Ligand binder design. Structure first.
Ligand SMILES: O=C(c1ccccc1)c1ccccc1
Ligand SMILES: O=C(c1ccccc1)c1ccccc1
Lengths: 159, 155
């Protein structure tokens, strides 16, 4: 026989995530204007369809682009996705706080690039959200006069 | 299983704004001085100060701003930024900060703000796992980009 089915409950991990480090066997891919110099914003895991949606930003041709990629899991355990070629992505380490992954990309010219990455989750606990809303209510502030900086398109540029 | 010793200076590092509320909506609307995107906070126990590093859009352009707040005997902080500010920390832990700020501008107008900020924690064991994986794939350390420091020092 082989290995047995892997238990999964990644739905919980969905939410805002950020890029910490990305390594590459080909520096061109992550250098300025590179296709994989990706600033993550959000990750959504769906245990039913067995997919992962990536929402990130990349600067291309001097302009900033918000990209949405959808990855599909395989019996293999790895995920496949189309972005600047074909990608085979593997989650090496995962938890409520971090994600260490390895990705293999083959561009249109058949060039194979291997990338490693570390991403961290921006966790907002319910207890702390309640403390904010109560405080906000005590100061007589209208829910309408509250801005969400986690999901706002009008944000600073890292480069 | 181990955890770093808890210290105030241990709270220093990359922080992000989650929510900001204002009694005066104009202060946090686009081009408002308090629509602040936090980058880093630096706490200093000995000196009784907190250094704020954030970005704010003004006249269609992003500005990086640094503000140093000083603690008072009553535990609150004072800071000079678009008038005088009295900053109060309502709840603080390794992962979150809830604060109340009172601001009085150069015209005598008072605005009361509330905010929820979160810290971006990078654990030592997670960094090691990343570096072990990176070397396993024969990736040179100079072929690695630090995205966190780019976002913390934008332009
Ligand atoms: O930005 C990555 C990526 C972006 C879009 C599709 C697949 C992967 C990536 C980089 C390094 C490791 C793992 C994933
Ligand atoms: O922008 C804030 C601020 C920035 C610099 C000095 C004082 C206050 C702030 C926002 C929300 C809650 C508490 C304080």
């Amino acid at each position: 026989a082989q290995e047995e089915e892997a238990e999964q409950n990644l739905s919980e991990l969905s939410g805002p995530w950020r890029t910490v480090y990305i390594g590459s066997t080909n520096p061109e891919k992550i250098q300025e204007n590179g296709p994989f110099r990706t600033y993550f914003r959000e990750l959504v895991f769906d245990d039913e369809k067995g997919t992962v949606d990536f929402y990130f930003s990349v600067k291309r041709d001097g302009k900033w682009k918000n990209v949405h990629v959808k990855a599909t899991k395989q019996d293999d355990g790895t995920y496949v996705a189309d972005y600047e070629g074909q990608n085979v992505f593997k989650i090496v380490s995962l938890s409520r706080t971090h994600l260490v992954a390895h990705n293999i990309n083959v561009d249109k010219h058949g060039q194979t690039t291997e990338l490693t990455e570390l991403f961290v989750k921006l966790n907002v606990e319910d207890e702390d959200l309640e403390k904010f809303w109560k405080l906000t209510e005590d100061k007589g502030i209208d829910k309408k006069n509250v801005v969400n900086f986690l999901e706002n398109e009008n944000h600073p540029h890292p480069e």
